[PDB]
Design a protein around this nucleic acid. Structure first.
Ligand SMILES: [Mg+2]
Ligand SMILES: [Mg+2]
Ligand SMILES: [Mg+2]
Ligand SMILES: [Mg+2]
Ligand SMILES: [Mg+2]
Ligand SMILES: [Mg+2]
Ligand SMILES: [Mg+2]
Ligand SMILES: [Mg+2]
Ligand SMILES: [Mg+2]
Ligand SMILES: [Mg+2]
Ligand SMILES: [Mg+2]
Ligand SMILES: [Mg+2]
Ligand SMILES: [Mg+2]
Ligand SMILES: [Mg+2]
Ligand SMILES: [Mg+2]
Ligand SMILES: [Mg+2]
Ligand SMILES: [Mg+2]
Ligand SMILES: [Mg+2]
Ligand SMILES: [Mg+2]
Ligand SMILES: [Mg+2]
Ligand SMILES: [Mg+2]
Ligand SMILES: [Mg+2]
Ligand SMILES: [Mg+2]
Ligand SMILES: [Mg+2]
Ligand SMILES: [Mg+2]
Ligand SMILES: [Mg+2]
Ligand SMILES: [Mg+2]
Ligand SMILES: [Mg+2]
Ligand SMILES: [Mg+2]
Ligand SMILES: [Mg+2]
Ligand SMILES: [Mg+2]
Ligand SMILES: [Mg+2]
Ligand SMILES: [Mg+2]
Ligand SMILES: [Mg+2]
Ligand SMILES: [Mg+2]
Ligand SMILES: [Mg+2]
Ligand SMILES: [Mg+2]
Ligand SMILES: [Mg+2]
Lengths: 204, 159, 137
RNA sequence: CGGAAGGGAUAACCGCUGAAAGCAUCUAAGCGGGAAGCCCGCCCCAAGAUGAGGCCUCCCACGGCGUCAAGCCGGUAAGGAC
RNA sequence: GGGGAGGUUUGGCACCUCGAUGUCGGCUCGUCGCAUCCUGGGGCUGAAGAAGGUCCCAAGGGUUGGGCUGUUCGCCCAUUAA
RNA sequence: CCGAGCGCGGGAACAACCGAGACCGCCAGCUAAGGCCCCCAAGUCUGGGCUAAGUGGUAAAGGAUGUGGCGCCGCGAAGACAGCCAGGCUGGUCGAGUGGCGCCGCGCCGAAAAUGA
């Protein structure tokens, strides 16, 4: 159940055999496993990789007593990658062979208070003939005396984006073990410089 | 019910013979007995449901007996041109009009023979189980009704 | 002027569910929950025993229930219907079938719910042994 | 990039064995197959789940009134806020 | 000839509303029902196959763009799995 | 009867259905309708049956080897019905009941609707 943390670094395309390939580049620095979660102590199994190199200064926390309790140069972030227990002390791009399909998780760019038109690809009014103050409005939201209420979940405008977005099943292209790069099929959430986590898919 | 090894119990009955060993879940409120080299089953009343339950056990048993006696088996014809079947190890492959030969691995307690590519005998200690796998085979290609083709038993052709 | 209880220590109990008709069982568990077998009963107060049940998963139930009986659970939304048949219940978390039926014979207020909290259910046994436990029937 | 796969339980329906009712029957005891649907599985939210869960880790006694009891006032710890 | 279900039509009644419950069609946003148009599963067929017919099961999702009319509806054009 | 008893009890809730005509007070008693497993006061009361549909938890013409109870007609130990062997009812073998009608009780199907049951 491989997995590694990374940062959307950027993307460009590259040429394979004889066709262009849109790739996004994740840098997936050597993640120091920092705790492991057993079926006995924790009740479920997984593994806590750290990520960015941290100033032993800003780690003044009780956090020291964690890194210390596993002798790991203090990282910046650390998330668990459920149901996957490795070896050594660190996970690296090497879990990924080119052609393996991965699911990358990310955090969608944040659009703030979003129009129903942008948030739901709603139709909205007519630029022309009729009224002019409902141009981008959702229009009707209900019925009459029955129900005589709005349904929960009704699509309405408001803070949208900047949320946990997993885009399943992209193809790993050439992984640069050297500079710690991981090449993929482009479609990966959040802005450049964002934390992301890559994993094995569900194809079969 | 002779030459055998019938052994009562609360809700079930152990039936042993050369062939094998069968656990035969019987009603608890029935009374299976063991007269001589044979077996009885007597009923606690004459209520509609005790009768139903009665015969059903008095057969469910007999079957378990003969089941470790001569044992059980069924016969499968495989008519129609192309249609045939090679036995392979334990499980039997069989090509039958499909674009894919069907490999049918054998349930435990079962074993089937292919005397001829056109015939298939299913042997096992257990009626119910035999009967199933039997039909379970006929199923791969039920008998057409516009021409003799596919698996039959040894009963009329639908015509 | 009618007697009125002062504070008291809560009696506990232990029950074995195996073989019990689920409802017939709930009824009692209920009547225990309200301090209602005690003769110094007081409505407004909640001096009920602390009924503890075990071997829930084994609860007998008459007729076709298991298959036939459906548990409605209305989420907030369009088509939040959610019908759950009696079996799926026991098959996954089964304590509920019992819980989901004492809550039912308990009255409705804040007290009712104070009470539902006294009742403690496991399919087991192996309840957190602690002290009291005077088995019943 | 996605709709799946897959596991499980079922619908009509197809059956294995079998009485009642010597036969016959899918059923009444029992069992197998069987849906884009049900439950799972994937994605997201989520412990105000007041039934407030778990793990790892860091800080740690009293300095004065209330006679047992709940507290009250202060400078602090980790740590947090401005 | 007979018995029903539904409460989408046309009505009957005149029960709330005449110190006001804005009307048809469209748009926008839908969500439910199933008596299912498609897709899935099936029975019979006067089912060779292919295509169909009739009935059963199944709401999960889907259910196009134009011409004419304020139209709903309907006709028509070009498609469609529908 | 409500109106004027939208005062009280029952009926989930509900002017007129069931009970009953509220002068005031009571931390007394009997009852009424309706009830006595829990929410909910009082029987998990006693005895005899019926029903396996959640019927009860409230739909028809019509349909059906549901189930139990009763009544009548037909063949049967001179061998019947059921199958199994032979022939086109006959025979045997088996060996005790079998076929049809009719009436009552409870039930089954007929039974599709729109916010969550
Ligand atoms: Mg920081
Ligand atoms: Mg526009
Ligand atoms: Mg205007
Ligand atoms: Mg205006
Ligand atoms: Mg409303
Ligand atoms: Mg037979
Ligand atoms: Mg048969
Ligand atoms: Mg809650
Ligand atoms: Mg100190
Ligand atoms: Mg000190
Ligand atoms: Mg300081
Ligand atoms: Mg400090
Ligand atoms: Mg800060
Ligand atoms: Mg009109
Ligand atoms: Mg009038
Ligand atoms: Mg007004
Ligand atoms: Mg107004
Ligand atoms: Mg108005
Ligand atoms: Mg109008
Ligand atoms: Mg068809
Ligand atoms: Mg056809
Ligand atoms: Mg065809
Ligand atoms: Mg249906
Ligand atoms: Mg239907
Ligand atoms: Mg729906
Ligand atoms: Mg629809
Ligand atoms: Mg939807
Ligand atoms: Mg037009
Ligand atoms: Mg017209
Ligand atoms: Mg009067
Ligand atoms: Mg009581
Ligand atoms: Mg009794
Ligand atoms: Mg009794
Ligand atoms: Mg009965
Ligand atoms: Mg008639
Ligand atoms: Mg009738
Ligand atoms: Mg009948
Ligand atoms: Mg008569």
């Amino acid at each position: 159940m491989k997995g590694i943390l990374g940062v959307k670094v950027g993307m460009t395309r590259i040429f394979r055999d004889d066709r262009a390939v849109p790739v996004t580049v994740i840098l997936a620095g050597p993640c120091p496993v920092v705790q492991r979660r057993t079926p006995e102590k924790d009740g479920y199994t997984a593994v806590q990789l750290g990520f960015l190199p941290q100033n032993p200064k800003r780690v003044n926390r009780p956090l020291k007593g964690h890194f210390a309790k596993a002798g790991v140069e203090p990282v910046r972030i650390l998330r668990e990658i459920r149901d996957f227990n490795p070896e050594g002390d660190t996970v690296t791009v090497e879990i990924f062979k080119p052609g393996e399909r991965v699911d990358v998780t990310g955090t969608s760019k944040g659009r703030g208070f979003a129009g129903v038109m942008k948030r739901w690809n709603f139709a909205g009014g007519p630029d022309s003939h009729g009224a002019h103050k409902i141009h981008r409005h959702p229009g009707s939201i209900g019925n009459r005396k029955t129900p005589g209420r709005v349904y929960k979940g009704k699509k309405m405008a408001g803070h949208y984006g900047a949320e946990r977005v997993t885009v399943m099943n992209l193809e790993v292209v050439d992984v640069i073990p050297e500079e710690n790069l991981l090449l993929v099929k482009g479609a990966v959430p959040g802005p450049n410089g964002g934390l992301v986590i890559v994993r094995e898919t569900k194809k079969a | 019910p002779k030459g055998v090894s019938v052994e009562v119990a609360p809700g079930r009955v152990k039936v042993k013979g050369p062939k094998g060993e069968l656990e035969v879940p019987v009603s608890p409120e029935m009374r299976v007995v063991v007269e001589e080299g044979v077996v009885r089953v007597e009923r606690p009343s004459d209520e509609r449901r005790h009768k139903s339950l009665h015969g059903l056990t008095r057969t469910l048993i007999a079957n378990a007996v003969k089941g470790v006696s001569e044992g059980y088996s069924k016969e499968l014809l495989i008519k129609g041109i192309g249609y045939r079947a090679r036995l392979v190890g334990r499980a039997l492959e069989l090509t039958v009009g499909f674009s894919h030969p069907v490999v049918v691995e054998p349930p435990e307690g079962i074993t089937f023979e292919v005397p001829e590519p056109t015939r298939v005998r299913v042997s096992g200690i257990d009626k119910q189980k035999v009967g199933q796998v039997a039909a379970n085979i006929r199923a791969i290609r039920k008998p057409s009704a516009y021409h003799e083709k596919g698996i039959y038993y040894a009963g009329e052709p639908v015509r | 002027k009618t007697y009125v209880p002062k504070q008291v220590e809560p009696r506990w109990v232990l029950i074995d569910a195996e073989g019990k008709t689920l409802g017939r069982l709930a009824t009692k568990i209920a009547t225990l929950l309200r301090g209602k077998h005690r003769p110094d009963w007081t409505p407004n107060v909640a001096m009920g025993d602390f009924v503890v049940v075990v071997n829930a998963d084994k609860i007998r139930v008459t007729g076709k229930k298991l298959e036939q009986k459906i548990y409605t659970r209305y989420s907030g939304y369009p088509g939040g219907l959610k019908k759950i048949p009696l079996e799926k219940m026991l098959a996954t978390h089964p304590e509920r079938v019992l819980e989901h039926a004492v809550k039912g014979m308990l009255p409705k207020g804040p007290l009712g719910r104070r009470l539902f909290k006294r009742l403690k259910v496991y399919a087991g046994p192996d309840h957190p042994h602690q002290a009291q436990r005077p088995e019943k029937l």
